[PDB]
Scaffold this motif. Structure first.
Motif, short mmCIF file in Angstrom:
data_model
loop_
_atom_site.label_atom_id
_atom_site.label_comp_id
_atom_site.label_asym_id
_atom_site.label_seq_id
_atom_site.Cartn_x
_atom_site.Cartn_y
_atom_site.Cartn_z
N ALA A 129 28.52 95.13 71.99
CA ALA A 129 28.59 95.72 70.65
C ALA A 129 30.02 95.88 70.14
O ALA A 129 30.22 96.00 68.92
CB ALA A 129 27.87 97.06 70.63
N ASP A 130 31.02 95.89 71.02
CA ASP A 130 32.40 96.06 70.58
C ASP A 130 33.08 94.74 70.22
O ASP A 130 34.22 94.77 69.75
CB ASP A 130 33.22 96.82 71.63
CG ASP A 130 33.31 96.09 72.95
OD1 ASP A 130 32.34 95.39 73.32
OD2 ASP A 130 34.35 96.22 73.63
N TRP A 131 32.42 93.60 70.43
CA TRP A 131 33.00 92.31 70.09
C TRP A 131 32.81 92.02 68.61
O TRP A 131 31.73 92.25 68.05
CB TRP A 131 32.32 91.19 70.87
CG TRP A 131 32.56 91.16 72.36
CD1 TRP A 131 33.07 92.16 73.13
CD2 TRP A 131 32.30 90.06 73.24
NE1 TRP A 131 33.14 91.75 74.44
CE2 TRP A 131 32.67 90.46 74.53
CE3 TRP A 131 31.79 88.77 73.05
CZ2 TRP A 131 32.54 89.62 75.64
CZ3 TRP A 131 31.66 87.93 74.15
CH2 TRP A 131 32.04 88.37 75.43
N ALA A 132 33.85 91.49 67.97
CA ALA A 132 33.74 91.01 66.60
C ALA A 132 33.04 89.65 66.61
O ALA A 132 33.23 88.84 67.52
CB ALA A 132 35.12 90.88 65.97
N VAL A 133 32.22 89.41 65.58
CA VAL A 133 31.39 88.21 65.51
C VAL A 133 31.49 87.61 64.11
O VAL A 133 31.23 88.30 63.12
CB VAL A 133 29.91 88.52 65.83
CG1 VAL A 133 29.06 87.27 65.62
CG2 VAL A 133 29.76 89.04 67.25
N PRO A 191 36.05 88.98 72.13
CA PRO A 191 36.05 90.12 73.04
C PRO A 191 37.31 90.92 72.81
O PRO A 191 38.39 90.35 72.63
CB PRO A 191 36.08 89.47 74.43
CG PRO A 191 35.78 88.02 74.21
CD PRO A 191 36.29 87.71 72.83
N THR A 192 37.18 92.24 72.79
CA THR A 192 38.33 93.08 72.50
C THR A 192 39.45 92.79 73.49
O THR A 192 39.25 92.87 74.71
CB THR A 192 37.91 94.56 72.55
OG1 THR A 192 36.70 94.73 71.80
CG2 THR A 192 38.98 95.43 71.93
N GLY A 193 40.60 92.38 72.97
CA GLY A 193 41.78 92.11 73.77
C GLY A 193 41.78 90.82 74.56
O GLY A 193 42.78 90.54 75.24
NA NA Z 1 36.63 94.69 69.08
#
Ligand code: NA
Ligand code: NA
Length: 260
Positions: free
Chosen positions: A197-201, A222-224
């Motif tokens: 849920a924290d990944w931008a798409v 994926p974050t970072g």
């Molecule tokens: Na993110």
């Protein structure tokens, strides 16, 4: 192949998957060079082609298009909404990506010289698989064995990487393309249901519907960590077969899980 092969037995059709991790270079591939109908997924590449054209034709994006009601097509929610006032090329591009707006797609195809013009743009970035041949709504027929209006999961993923992360578009055009892909006003699942849920798409779906045909492609951050690009396409042998969003999500999960 084994997990994907089991999944396509439960689906009752064919599934094609390609995924690349742009950090490690790892890939996941299943039927990745087979052809599948594009359906509305071509509309993402259409918007990228319009952005590319703007680099050589400054003023294109702000051009008002005062289309008539005959330009309208079933499932044109934005262009119908603004029929009385018109829309700019940029607004039509946003509508084609974010809302799969059919009339907007046809109007933008006209600006590029038709399906052949969009195909030529894809060739110009190195994609020799993509072909668009027809307009909305005819391009959605998804007839078995028909190569019109098809591409492969690998070619879709490679082209999406070039346009969203590579240097096929100038950085300002690239950011606009990414921003349009990240807009999810129709609330699609598929790849979005497969990622944390924290990944931008940034995604674009397609749903020919007929012959159980539906698809999705996305760039995911994926974050970072380095982004991943992937494409999942499906088709089924019988005209009445139902497409499955759950199958697309399940295949996308396997693709992300299979990366190194
Ligand atoms: Na993110
Ligand atoms: Na693999």
């Amino acid at each position: 192949a084994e997990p994907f092969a089991k999944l396509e037995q439960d689906f009752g059709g064919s599934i094609g998957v390609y995924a690349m991790d742009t950090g490690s270079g790892a890939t996941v591939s299943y039927r990745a060079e087979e052809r599948f109908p594009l359906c509305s997924s071509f509309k993402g590449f259409l918007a990228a082609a319009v952005l590319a054209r703007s680099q050589q034709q400054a003023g294109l994006l702000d051009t008002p298009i005062r289309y008539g009601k005959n330009a309208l097509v079933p499932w044109s929610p934005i262009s119908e909404k603004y029929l009385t006032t018109g829309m700019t090329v940029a607004e039509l591009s946003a509508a084609a990506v974010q809302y799969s707006d059919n009339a907007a797609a046809n109007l933008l195809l006209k600006e590029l010289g038709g399906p052949a013009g969009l195909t030529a743009f894809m060739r110009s970035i190195g994609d020799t698989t993509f072909r668009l041949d027809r307009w909305e709504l005819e391009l959605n027929s998804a007839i078995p064995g028909d190569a019109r209006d098809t591409s492969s999961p690998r070619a879709v993923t490679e082209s999406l990487q070039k346009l969203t992360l590579g240097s096929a578009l100038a950085a300002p055009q690239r950011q606009q393309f990414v921003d349009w892909l990240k807009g999810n006003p129709t609330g699609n699942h598929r790849i979005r249901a497969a990622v944390p849920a924290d990944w931008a798409v940034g995604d674009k779906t397609g749903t020919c519907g007929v012959y159980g045909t539906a698809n999705d492609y996305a760039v995911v951050w994926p974050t970072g960590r380095a982004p991943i690009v992937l494409a999942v396409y499906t088709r089924a042998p019988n005209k009445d077969d139902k497409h499955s969003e759950a199958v697309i999500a399940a295949a996308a999960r396997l693709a992300l899980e299979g990366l190194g």
